[PDB]
Every structure is written in C-alpha cells, then in structure tokens.
Design a protein around this ligand. Structure first.
Ligand SMILES: Nc1ncnc2c1ncn2[C@@H]1O[C@H](COP(=O)(O)OP(=O)(O)OC[C@H]2NC[C@H](O)[C@@H]2O)[C@@H](O)[C@H]1O
Length: 521
C-alpha cells in the first residue's frame, strides 16, 4: 500500500481549524475562585475587578521559612553571619543588605554587578558578567542604555524591593506527586521576576547538592555570563517585559497547576477512537493555537535553559511569555507521570528565527480576552519528552508507553466533559534537541489525544512532507475504523519485527510504510 497523492498546493489538511473547540468559547463556567487545600490563591478574590491591579491577600507580609514554601528573600530568616564589636558571630538581615545594595544609581554596568554581588559574595569570583557588560556598552546605544539605567533598572528595583508588600502570602512549593495549584497576580510575578533578575533569591545557587537541587535555576545570573551572541537578544526580550510591567502595572491573574496521574490507560485494551486532526506546515503553536491548549516541549526541569544557555522551543516561549519563568521558582522536576499546566500568562514580545537565528522582533500587545478569573485565555502545558541518545531506543515499548503517558497526563483534564475541552495545539515534540522521530511522536501524541478525548492541531513547522504523511496516516487509520488499542499493538508489532533484532543503526522499513502494510495488505 502506497498512500494516495494529496492536493499539492494546499497549506493544511484534515478538519478545518475554525471547527476545533477553543476557549474561552468552549469553556465551562468557572466557579467562585476560592482558596482550598489544593489551591493557593495569593490575591483578594472579593476585590477582583477588571482593569484594577489586584490587592494581595493577606494585607501584610506573613513569612514562612521552611521546606514547604519558597524561601522568600525578604524573610527575617534570610541571614548572613556578621562579626560584632568583639568578634563573636551574629546574624545580619540579608534583606536589609540587599535593600541598601540596590538603592544606588547604576551609571555603568560595573555598578549593577557590584550591587548583585554585594549580597552574593560567595560568587564574587564565580559569576561572569561579560554578556551584560557587552549588552549595555556595545549592543545598546547611548540613547537606549541611558533609558535603561536612569529608568528601567530603578523601576525594577522598586517593584523588587516592594516584594514583601506584594507577595504577602507564602508561596508553597509544587513538589513531586502534589496535585496542586497556585494562582497569583501578574504584578506579584513581576515582583518576583524583578527579584530573580537581581539574583536575590536565597539558597538557589549551590553547585553542591542542596535543598533546591531538585529545582531549576531561577536567579538570572547566567544571563550575564559568556561571550554568547544570543544572550543579548534574550536581554532585549526580557527587558521588553520589565519595561512593560513597570510602566503599566498589569491587572491579570495567572495559574500554575502541577498534575500527577497515578493511573493510566491499559493501551493494549484502549477502546476509545481517534479524534479529529488538523495538520499544517505553516503557523506556529503560539502564533496560531490562539485559544487551544498550547504544548511546551519541556525539559523535566521546567523552563529548560531559559535563564542562560538554551533558546529553542521552550526557552523561546518562556522569553516571549516571561510570566512562565516564575514557574521555575517553585516547580520541582517532573517525574515521568507529571506535568505543569499554566493558565493565564501574557505574550509581551514577538520574535524571528530560532536558536542562534533568534532575534527579538518587537513588543506584542497581547490580544487575548480574559476569563472569569481575570486570566488571559491562553493555557500552556509543559510536558517533557525523553532525550533519546540512540535513534532505535524510542521504539522499545517501555519508551513508547512512557511518551504516551506523559502526553496523556498533559492533555487529560479529569472531571471535564470532552465537549468542553479545547483542541491540543502541538508539533514536533521531542524531535529536535531530544532527537526523536517526528512521525512516531506524531502518532503517539495522536493516540494520547484520542485517549484524552481532545482533538489535535499539529504544526509541522515547515516540514510539508510530514504534514502529508501525518495526515495520510491519520486518515488511513480512521477510515479503517481503528481504536487506540490496535494502533498501539501495531507499534509493538513494529518493535518485535524490525527493531528488537536490528543489526543496523536503522531498520529496513520505516514506521508508516510498515503500519500501512501490516493492517490492510
Ligand atoms: N513555535 C513552534 N511551533 C511549532 N513547532 C515548533 C516551534 N518551535 C519549534 N518547533 C518544532 O518542534 C521541534 C522541537 O523543538 P525543541 O525545543 O527542539 O523540542 P524538543 O522536545 O525536541 O527539545 C526539548 C529540549 N529543548 C529545550 C527544552 O529545554 C527541552 O529540554 C523543533 O525542532 C521544530 O521542528
């Protein structure tokens, strides 16, 4: 069986995009946003009104310095040792120290550094600031850099130091196995990120295995190091944010939910049928999946290398929607059965390129209308694929079972009637830096979505052959009436037969050919 040749000029195939369900239009009436055992809410829900920056709850700063919550910098327990009159050691408030370090003009880059390091003295002789020093003096002109130091940086310091009156409620850590949600103000997030920018957060820098060894970086220290060329475009994009939220205090709310599923489908038996597909080689997930569930091609440590190294799908999403970065403050690494769902973040910048082609394009005025909880109508899910080192590895059932489960966990929304759930807006998940095969993930995903009762929208990101092969396969499986079960079974029939005992680094027969042949020929 060789697949039927399809319309050679057309840009998309399958169900027309504008027929897929999308929020807010498809959404269930959200209930009274109340705090609960599983939902921390850090603003005044009674006072919550369109256009008005939310008042934080409770009104005055309550601190928790422990292993259940973020260790806020401004805590009275954030200490450093100090010699007294006699030489005997006492503790000094690190917060005060920070305050009086950052309340100074920064008229050169050397100053900002001096500042950050005044509290981070252990890393005086470990933290490179080239990238910054370069950005300020060489990449930004007299005009731009003047606006940065008498305006933006001081504005950032203001919201940074207002933290205790902004994030008055303790932020719990979203640990492994917790099914928990946090919802906080865009304003609150900007304060924390401002703090992140000034490398303010305590106990989050150990090379040595610490308490937070299990969590991603959050201080921005690494954005300052290296002779890397993409650092500046990164800075341009984050300042675009810091400039937008200092000038006009944002009035939205944002929700982070960790999801852990303990019980999965018995895929061999799964009776549910395939869902509707729309696949296109133009568009992008952020660009075109307006209203749908947009996937983040995530690292287990969420956000990937946004604070320093990387600059691919996730890092990019996290830069254009910087409010996602704060997820790193409190989200432990993802186990194989976990994900992070962020409803509410805004897009502040537009871009061009990818990896080392990345340029900051312009500011973006996010268009998304807000929901019942004053959260933008855009829901990202971060799911982490496996980073396959040898290409065949991924067809081992265990590897397929897993990628299936992750995808599932990221899509499934327990309790929710399918007819309310939007489409999933995805693409070549795990088939870039993580080096997996697109044709397989495509299927896997398409199977998981099926199991989740969510229709898919796949962006092939330029690859039009993929658009066809994808589509061809979807339509072949569908007209031949196949459920998730059989389609899974065949994937293992593929392993046993071409992969299990394979001399070469690649099989003689690719997946789709094999599947086509193995069902109806
Ligand atoms: N905006 C957008 N829309 C749709 N498709 C995209 C987009 N950007 C990239 N892609 C496609 O998806 C592929 C995957 O991007 P990538 O970030 O390389 O996804 P992976 O899961 O393979 O990489 C994961 C790791 N990299 C960054 C994260 O920290 C992960 O640790 C990429 O090569 C493209 O073909």
């Amino acid at each position: 069986y060789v697949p039927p040749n399809l319309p050679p000029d057309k840009k998309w195939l399958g169900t027309p995009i504008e027929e897929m369900r999308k929020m807010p239009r498809c959404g269930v009436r959200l209930p009274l946003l109340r705090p609960s055992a599983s939902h921390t809410v850090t603003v005044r829900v009674d006072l919550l009104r369109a256009g008005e920056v939310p008042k934080p709850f409770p009104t005055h700063y309550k601190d928790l310095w422990d292993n259940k919550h973020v260790k806020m910098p401004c805590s009275e327990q954030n200490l450093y040792p100090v010699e007294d009159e006699n030489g005997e050691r006492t503790a000094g408030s690190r917060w005060e120290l920070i305050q009086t370090a950052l309340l100074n003009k920064f008229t050169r880059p050397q100053n900002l550094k001096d500042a950050i390091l005044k509290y981070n003295v252990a890393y005086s002789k470990k933290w490179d600031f080239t990238a910054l020093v370069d950005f300020w003096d060489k990449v930004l002109e007299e005009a731009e850099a003047q606006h940065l130091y008498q305006s933006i940086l001081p504005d950032m310091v203001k919201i940074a130091l207002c933290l205790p009156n902004i994030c008055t409620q303790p932020i719990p850590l979203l640990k492994q196995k917790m099914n928990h949600s946090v919802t906080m103000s865009q304003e609150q997030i900007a304060s924390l990120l401002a703090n992140a920018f000034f490398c303010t957060f305590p106990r989050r820098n150990a090379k040595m295995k610490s308490e937070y060894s299990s969590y991603p970086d959050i201080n921005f220290n690494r954005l300052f190091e290296g002779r890397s060329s993409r650092k500046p475009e990164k800075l341009k994009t984050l300042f675009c944010y810091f400039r937008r939220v200092t000038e006009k205090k944002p009035t939205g709310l944002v929700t982070f939910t960790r999801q852990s599923l303990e019980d999965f489908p018995e895929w061999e038996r799964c009776d549910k049928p395939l869902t509707r597909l729309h696949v296109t080689y133009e568009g992008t997930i952020e660009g075109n999946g307006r209203g749908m569930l947009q996937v983040d091609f995530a690292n287990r440590f969420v956000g990937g290398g946004v604070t320093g190294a990387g600059l691919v799908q996730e890092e990019i999403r996290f830069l254009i929607n910087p409010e996602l970065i704060v997820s790193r403050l409190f989200t432990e690494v993802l186990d194989h059965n976990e994900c992070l769902i962020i409803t509410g973040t805004e897009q502040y910048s537009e871009y061009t390129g990818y990896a080392e082609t990345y340029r900051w394009a312009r500011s973006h005025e996010d268009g998304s209308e807000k929901d019942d909880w004053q959260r933008c109508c855009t829901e990202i899910v971060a799911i982490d694929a496996l980073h396959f080192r040898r290409y065949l590895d991924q067809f081992v059932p265990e590897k397929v079972r897993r990628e299936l489960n992750k995808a599932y966990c990221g899509f499934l929304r327990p309790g929710v009637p399918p007819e309310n759930l939007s489409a999933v807006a995805t693409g070549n998940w795990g088939c870039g830096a993580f080096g997996g095969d697109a044709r397989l993930k495509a299927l896997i995903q398409l199977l998981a979505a099926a199991a989740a009762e969510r229709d898919v929208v796949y962006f092939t990101f330029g690859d039009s052959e993929l658009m066809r092969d994808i589509y061809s396969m979807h339509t072949f499986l569908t007209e031949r009436k196949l459920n998730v079960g059989k389609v899974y079974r065949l994937l293992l029939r593929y392993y046993r037969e071409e992969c299990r005992d394979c001399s070469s680094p690649g099989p003689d027969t690719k997946l789709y050919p094999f599947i086509y042949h193995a069902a109806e020929s």
